[PDB]
Write a protein that binds this ligand. Sequence first.
Ligand SMILES: COc1ccc(S(=O)(=O)N(CC(C)C)C[C@@H](O)[C@H](Cc2ccccc2)NC(=O)O[C@H]2CCC[C@@]23CCO[C@H](c2ccccc2OC)C3)cc1
Lengths: 99, 99
Amino acid sequence: PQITLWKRPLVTIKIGGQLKEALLDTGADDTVIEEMSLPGRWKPKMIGGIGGFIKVRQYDQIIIEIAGHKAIGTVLVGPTPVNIIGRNLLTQIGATLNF
Amino acid sequence: PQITLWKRPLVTIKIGGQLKEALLDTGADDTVIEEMSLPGRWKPKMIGGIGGFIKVRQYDQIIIEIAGHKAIGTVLVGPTPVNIIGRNLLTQIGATLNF
Ligand SMILES: COc1ccc(S(=O)(=O)N(CC(C)C)C[C@@H](O)[C@H](Cc2ccccc2)NC(=O)O[C@H]2CCC[C@@]23CCO[C@H](c2ccccc2OC)C3)cc1
């Protein structure tokens, strides 16, 4: 699709058998999802943003369907105000910024 | 142009007579720029992201040059580590996300 930016670019994603809504976020290197249960081993880690840092759990090799496109990558799980799909997954669905 | 996302989507902008490097950020509602003086009046605002909030100064009707386009709009100035071009200006340069 072609997504204009008059509204937040929210999409439906499928992760760990659950549907979620998430924001396509070209300004985020990594993907950060609100607290949820995922299978497999995770590592504790901290990440930062504009206001400070948060504690997250890092899951590797997670399959995610982003607006019906399949991708695999690392997902960080923690207390984010919005689920954000970062560049590590945007590249894998072939997303580009065009103007 | 068409900008892929294997690296950060950084561009040179001209604002307040100065050249700065900034991120084209679909996840940002507004544009947030590091501390500088701009020639206009400002109002206080607080914005929130991952980790908490920061206090910024809101300037209106600021002209910013982004790759052959001139956008005019609101700019938030505050303690951000990275200059962020948000949707309020991305719409004016006709930017879309495509996949
Ligand atoms: C109303 O207007 C606004 C309101 C809020 C915002 S916003 O900016 O809050 N946002 C909103 C989004 C979180 C919903 C835009 C988002 O695209 C930021 C941009 C940004 C880039 C660089 C530095 C700081 C902000 N990406 C980010 O937060 O990406 C972080 C989180 C995961 C990947 C990330 C990349 C940058 O390095 C981070 C990091 C890691 C370790 C240590 C310190 C760190 O960072 C200080 C990690 C804007 C406008």
